[PDB]
Design a protein around this ligand. Structure first.
Ligand SMILES: Cc1ncc(COP(=O)(O)O)c(C/N=C(\CNc2ccccc2O)C(=O)O)c1O
Ligand SMILES: Cc1ncc(COP(=O)(O)O)c(C/N=C(\CNc2ccccc2O)C(=O)O)c1O
Ligand SMILES: O=P(O)(O)OCCNS(=O)(=O)c1ccc(OC(F)(F)F)cc1
Ligand SMILES: O=P(O)(O)OCCNS(=O)(=O)c1ccc(OC(F)(F)F)cc1
Ligand SMILES: [Cl-]
Ligand SMILES: [Cl-]
Ligand SMILES: [Cl-]
Ligand SMILES: [Cl-]
Ligand SMILES: [Cl-]
Ligand SMILES: [Cl-]
Ligand SMILES: [Cl-]
Ligand SMILES: [Cl-]
Ligand SMILES: [Cl-]
Ligand SMILES: [Cl-]
Ligand SMILES: [Cl-]
Ligand SMILES: [Cl-]
Ligand SMILES: [Cl-]
Ligand SMILES: [Cl-]
Ligand SMILES: [Cs+]
Ligand SMILES: [Cs+]
Ligand SMILES: [Cs+]
Ligand SMILES: [Cs+]
Lengths: 395, 268, 395, 268
């Protein structure tokens, strides 16, 4: 039994070993209590403002939409301390960990932005942090490994499986199942067992709340659509949440298409997977005919995950949100375009969202549309990877 | 069938506990796994717990993770696992056979169809490792419709509500977890918690088998002495397979020796 | 003749080849006009808010001052788009370049933060950017080289001399003396010939104006001191300016002590050099007995410059500001301390300011003092350098 | 003394222009530099412009930057430059000698003391490259007190106010800049701007010598034809030194040949 609904339609639930149920129930009770606690809310608000730097800017692009009827704004989560939206909910979860008397933190990371967020919050609030990260990601997102370690976090490379996010998630959960008495599992996305999809949404929803206020101030109306990339679903649900009841506002989520959906080398389970049970949830996943979990692929480590959070699967099912895919090459073009024409170096994850917005504009250049892209992170972590690609393909 | 019920009544009459080895089906290949299983039985196993290889086994430590990997390297699929199960049952008509499953393998082509396949090959119980009692309804319903015992876990910090649920919902045996964490021989658990054993009996639960970290005959004796009906050992058995991959004769000799000694300890 | 005073007491002036005087006079006239132009001010304010992310947070440190009577706040210029305070005045100077009908930008850079700022503003506002950078700095600040090039700037390594900031400055000025008809020289610090020290101060003074407002809001009083590192002087004069007439507020500038003042391997001309004429100004500089310009040294590329802006030399001369030095090792300790205890990775330049504030606290731990350190940039650019040091010295 | 005044009166009587080479003092060493300078004079130089090596020569392109570096590699200091100047003057009593200085070398141990040292060794003029007329007061005052001509620059886009200042403040010769940019032979300037030449004469300025990018006899002729009193060539001369470092005999032969041809072009 739970205080809050663990399901979004068919999707969600608490598919963990029995040993972990009390920890999830404890977390849910602590969240419900904290959400009603003016002191907790004031502490969280103070950190978001004075430590992380909220509210983040909403930037109107004025070169990349020239000659079209698209107006495009970027919600600048790249400006948050740490360099990505991941910092918002880590500050909330760290405060929950302290509220529950935990002294240690376990986290998984792919892009290393959740790892960096977990490490910085742990240094600030006096928690001992260990971070699991796939060995492939340790290489391709190396700047973040250095940042995590300088902040005193233990970073544990995971060589198992695909040596990417799925495998880091597996190791984090294995660890927690033995260490939950002293350690909080700071899950890094709006996925996993209840109550994580709900908590992560509630601790990310300032993204859309601020966006709505800022777009009303600048344009006097709501956006025609908000667009966000989907790795596990946190930045997208953070942007979407405050708009769900504004029926006129399109909600577009962008999954990684990798080398192309037809290659099978992608990370787009919402539109190309099928429902399964893994990582504590019932959700769309990439799986073999026999029900083995498939390895995903994306150029971007933060999107390289074979499932998706259950609230996205639900929003899709009822038609409230639409989901699309963007390939590695489309993302790289959007990355280059933003660098050269707006002077903003976006994370490769965020480049997927931008690539789709650029397609919406280019495909129908006389369509009047007011769009917001959630620029979920900055691309400092990606510059060595992007350099090596653009060199090899001869630019 | 009533294979667990018959086994526990026989063991009670003989005043002994059960010793139940775990192995991964198809590790290190189909033919060798079948020989390993025959050796386990010949050496005294009272029942079997058998793993179906799964891509992401999250209640398992490195020893059993690596068993899963060996089976996959040998091309083992769930379909081939059902063929093996049929062959085991055809040789051994009374031994209780339990499967260790991850939810997605059961849910995959339909829960009802999975349990129907189990019944047809003569499986007695299924433990779904990542389905807690809270999510168990469609699994336990399908299991009972097909005469399969659904197995539930009693963790060390089970409250009263959970003990009552596990006693009502489960059949065959109750899984008494030694400790938190994942499977592994080197991580030894607590002494079986008497209060849990006693409450499960008070609520008429299926008999308790203690598992996780049981790797020595002393731990088997301690479990039965504490009032558990028996003990399960996995990683300790799988370590003997892993150690002896190039020496199949030596593998079976060491498996026989270990299983015999673990069984002797159940007597108790 | 000029519209504004080119001198601060004895220091400053316009010591450039005659060919460049009309360009400096043109720049001064354009600045004076812009400072009175409500449209220009609105455009600059809009970019600072909606593109760069101002106001930047003022963060109270709550672990590093434990057990002392020091209260320490950090002004978070590390949160500005680009990752340093350099972005503020580049946005102002780029708008001036456009106002004067220039289509190209020349800049020097040391840390690469001014180079990054120049490149991003040029991508945004449609200018062609070339950046000079010493070959040593190209190596030790490599992340910023990658960032500048991805944004479409030409980065030209300078192998001459010490292959550091002085040499980049030399090449930028040589270039400008032939290209001033079409190119604006976006000088990156509060130094060089008039009107640059004045313009750079006026386009950085939001740092101190915001700091004053924020500290009044949080503490109800002014700081006892504000502390900033000094490379050429821009972040320090930006913090100091709005406090100059608040006679109670200490102004402390921190020069790089390098391997130690006694070694001669430092960058501390204000306190250890003597007045000379170089880089278009009369200012304190490191020089030989014969008047050759000495090579400076610092672990931090942004401080590795053998002179200093003339308004700092003036403030020192009258006793309004005090200047001190911090060595490489003291800066590295402050870097490590902030990472591990506050979850903020500071630029090595900014670490010099923090190191001095930590000394003010540690030396007199029962002295009641309210301090602000200008955290001028983030340390992403430095993580590979710091790693390699801490590894070699065996940590 | 009145060495420039005497030279220009002699040149006017002969109806020819001046050709004035530039070299860096002490490049590629003290002894070789002295021989180079004697060769320049013997080949027809009317006056000399001589650079004192400086660590950061910001009006100079790579050719002259590298001359400065060679002199420093030979350990050349300003003190050694003054010893050289004394020796040159002792051999050549009437040739005008001008120094190319950067401000810090003049300002270093006192402006007045610098110009006093110049007077004692018999220097005729000093051009301070990074001191515009706007900052020139203490430099030109000290120069005049010590009978040294302060040289000022007339750039291509000089306005009327600047022309008047340069005419009033300067003595010896007026430096007519060919183009924007820094020193260098490959970057050829515009044809000497007639309007500037004519205005300087209207305001009774010291006679104009055109410089920057003059590397050919055709450019010397063009300068005199346009009404300038002569031309200065630096990088073209220094390139001959750089080319012939291992061949001192060949260096002097090529220097003689070039200087002779440049001088012939001034005739004009
Ligand atoms: C800038 C940026 N933008 C978008 C994303 C996509 O993540 P989303 O916003 O949650 O959908 C990331 C993902 N980053 C991960 C993956 N985080 C992650 C992903 C999936 C499962 C577990 C995880 O910890 C990380 O660990 O840093 C990111 O860094
Ligand atoms: C984060 C940070 N913090 C402080 C400093 C020190 O510079 P200050 O605030 O101007 O004193 C820098 C200096 N950075 C330089 C040097 N910039 C530079 C320095 C000296 C002469 C010319 C220059 O362009 C750069 O080019 O990025 C910095 O990046
Ligand atoms: O001896 P060890 O330490 O290898 O433990 C062997 C256990 N093998 S098993 O099939 O009983 C078994 C039983 C339950 C498991 O997970 C759950 F508890 F979450 F359900 C996992 C494996
Ligand atoms: O022939 P080039 O191109 O090498 O030019 C030679 C010039 N040598 S010089 O001493 O007259 C000379 C004169 C003025 C200079 O700078 C200033 F104009 F800013 F004052 C620099 C050098
Ligand atoms: Cl609900
Ligand atoms: Cl819902
Ligand atoms: Cl419902
Ligand atoms: Cl349901
Ligand atoms: Cl528990
Ligand atoms: Cl494709
Ligand atoms: Cl169901
Ligand atoms: Cl004044
Ligand atoms: Cl002043
Ligand atoms: Cl005055
Ligand atoms: Cl003055
Ligand atoms: Cl000019
Ligand atoms: Cl020291
Ligand atoms: Cl003076
Ligand atoms: Cs538009
Ligand atoms: Cs995904
Ligand atoms: Cs304190
Ligand atoms: Cs300095």
């Amino acid at each position: 039994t739970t205080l809050l609904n663990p399901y979004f339609g068919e999707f969600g639930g608490m598919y963990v070993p029995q040993i972990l149920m009390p920890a999830l129930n404890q977390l849910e009770e602590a969240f419900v209590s904290a959400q009603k606690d003016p002191e907790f809310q004031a502490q969280f608000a103070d950190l978001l403002k004075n430590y992380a730097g909220r509210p983040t800017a909403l930037t109107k692009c004025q070169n990349i939409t020239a000659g079209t009827r698209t107006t495009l704004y970027l919600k600048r989560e790249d400006l948050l301390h740490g360099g990505a939206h991941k910092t918002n909910q880590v500050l909330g979860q760290a405060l929950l960990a302290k509220r529950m008397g935990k002294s240690e933190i376990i986290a998984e990371t792919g892009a290393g932005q959740h790892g960096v967020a977990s490490a910085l919050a742990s240094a600030l609030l006096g928690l001992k942090c260990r971070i699991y990260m796939g060995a492939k990601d340790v290489e391709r997102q190396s700047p973040n490994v250095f940042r995590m370690r300088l902040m005193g976090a233990e970073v544990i490379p995971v060589h198992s499986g695909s040596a990417t996010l799925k495998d880091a998630c597996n190791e984090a959960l294995r660890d927690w199942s033995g260490s939950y008495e002293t350690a909080h599992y700071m899950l890094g996305t709006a996925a996993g067992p209840h109550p994580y999809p709900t908590i992560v949404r509630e601790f990310q929803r300032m993204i859309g709340e601020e966006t709505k206020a800022q777009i009303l101030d600048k344009e006097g109306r709501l956006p025609d659509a908000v667009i966000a990339c989907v790795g596990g679903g946190s930045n997208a649900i953070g942007m979407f949440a405050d708009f769900i009841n504004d029926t006129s506002v399109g909600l577009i989520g962008v999954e990684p298409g990798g080398h192309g959906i037809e290659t099978g080398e992608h990370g787009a389970p919402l539109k190309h997977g099928r429902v399964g049970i893994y990582f504590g949830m019932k959700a769309p996943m990439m799986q073999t005919a026999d029900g083995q979990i498939e390895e995903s692929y994306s150029i971007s480590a933060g999107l390289d995950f074979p499932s998706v959070g259950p609230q996205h699967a639900y929003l899709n099912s009822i038609g409230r949100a639409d989901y699309v895919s963007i390939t590695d090459d489309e993302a790289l073009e959007a990355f280059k375009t933003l660098c050269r024409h707006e002077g903003i170096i976006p994370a490769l994850e965020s480049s997927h969202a931008l690539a789709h917005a650029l397609k919406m504009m280019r495909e129908q250049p006389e369509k009047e549309q007011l769009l917001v892209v959630n620029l979920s992170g900055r691309g400092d972590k990606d510059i060595f990877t992007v350099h090596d690609i653009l060199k090899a393909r001869g630019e | 069938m009533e294979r667990y019920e018959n086994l526990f009544a026989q063991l009670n009459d003989r005043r002994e506990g059960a010793f139940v080895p775990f192995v991964t089906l198809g590790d290190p290949g189909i033919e060798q796994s079948l020989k390993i299983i025959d050796t386990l039985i010949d050496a005294g196993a009272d029942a079997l717990e058998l793993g179906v290889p799964f891509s992401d086994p999250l209640a398992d430590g490195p020893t059993i993770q690596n068993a899963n990997l060996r089976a996959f390297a040998a091309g083992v699929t769930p379909a081939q696992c059902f063929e093996m199960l049929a062959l085991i049952r055809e040789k051994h008509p009374t031994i209780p056979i339990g499967l260790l499953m991850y939810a997605n393998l059961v849910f995959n082509n339909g829960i009802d169809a999975f349990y129907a396949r189990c019944e047809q090959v003569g499986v007695d119980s299924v433990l779904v490792a990542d389905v807690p009692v809270e999510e168990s309804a469609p699994f336990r319903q399908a299991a009972l419709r097909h005469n399969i015992a659904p197995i539930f876990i009693c963790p060390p910090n089970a409250d009263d509500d959970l003990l009552r649920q596990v006693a009502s919902y489960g059949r065959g045996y109750t899984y008494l977890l030694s400790r938190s964490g994942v499977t592994g021989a080197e991580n030894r658990g607590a002494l079986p918690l008497h209060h849990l054993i006693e409450k499960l009996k008070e609520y008429h639960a299926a008999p308790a088998l203690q598992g996780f970290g049981i790797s020595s005959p002393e731990q088997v004796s301690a479990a039965v002495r504490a009032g558990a009906a028996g003990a399960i050992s996995g990683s300790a058995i799988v370590k003997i397979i892993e150690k002896n991959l190039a020496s199949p004769k030596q593998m079976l000799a060491e498996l026989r020796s270990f299983v015999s000694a673990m069984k002797a300890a159940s007597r108790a």
